[PDB]
Amino acid sequence: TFDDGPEGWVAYGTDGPLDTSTGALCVAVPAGSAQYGVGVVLNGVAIEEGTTYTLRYTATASTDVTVRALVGQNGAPYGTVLDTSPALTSEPRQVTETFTASATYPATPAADDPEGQIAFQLGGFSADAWTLCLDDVALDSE
């Protein structure tokens, strides 16, 4: 499902850009990365307070590592409506997370009101360099 590319998704703090050549979106986390310093991110995610969503995704890491998968503000104060700590390994795991939104995020950045985003932050969790691959990422309301 990344076989046509990121199509909106971007990464930052990675060694080289993201790679979708395999069909999955993959990124190389630099060794010695900093918390909040490396991420794979989709901005422009509108969220309605009270609505229930399920975030789905399949991921792999080339070292056994726990990271952070979230839905939140793209901008100060970086509030979250989903905040998790997925443990990842070599073998694909499908994560499914259901939540009811505790806040509203606009589809576009406004004054005092950053757009929402889906974020996988990857930095700071392992001293070592490692690779994350992502596939089958979906987010919908219930």
Ligand X SMILES: OC[C@H]1O[C@@H](O[C@H]2[C@H](O)[C@@H](O)[C@H](O[C@H]3[C@H](O)[C@@H](O)[C@H](O[C@H]4[C@H](O)[C@@H](O)[C@H](O[C@H]5[C@H](O)[C@@H](O)[C@H](O)O[C@@H]5CO)O[C@@H]4CO)O[C@@H]3CO)O[C@@H]2CO)[C@H](O)[C@@H](O)[C@@H]1O
Binding site for a copy of itself (CB under 8 A): 3-10, 17-21, 42-47, 107-108, 115-116, 139-141
Residue 140 binds which one of a copy of itself, ligand X, none, with CB within 5 to 8 A depending on kind?
Answer: a copy of itself
Determine, following the binding rule CB under 6 A, whether residue 74 of this chain makes contact with ligand X.
yes
Q: How big is the site for ligand X, counted in residues (CB under 6 A)?
A: 15
Determine, following the binding rule CB under 6 A, whether residue 41 of this chain makes contact with ligand X.
yes
Among candidate residues 66, 53, 78, the one with its CA nearest the CA of residue 138: 53
What character string, x for contact with ligand X (CB under 6 A) and - otherwise, covers 102-131? ------xx-----x-x-x------------
The nearest distance, CB 20 to ligand X, in angstroms, is: 12
**Cα–Cα distance between 3 and 21 in angstroms, integer?**
7
User: Taking a C-beta distance cutoff of 8 angstroms, is the pair 47, 54 a contact?
Assistant: no
User: Taking a C-beta distance cutoff of 8 angstroms, is the pair 106, 75 a contact?
Assistant: no
**Cα–Cα distance between 129 and 108 in angstroms, integer?**
34
Residue 107 binds which one of a copy of itself, ligand X, none, with CB within 5 to 8 A depending on kind?
Answer: a copy of itself
Token pair for 87: 């443990």
Residue 79 binds which one of a copy of itself, ligand X, none, with CB within 5 to 8 A depending on kind?
Answer: none
User: Taking a C-beta distance cutoff of 8 angstroms, is the pair 106, 46 a contact?
Assistant: yes
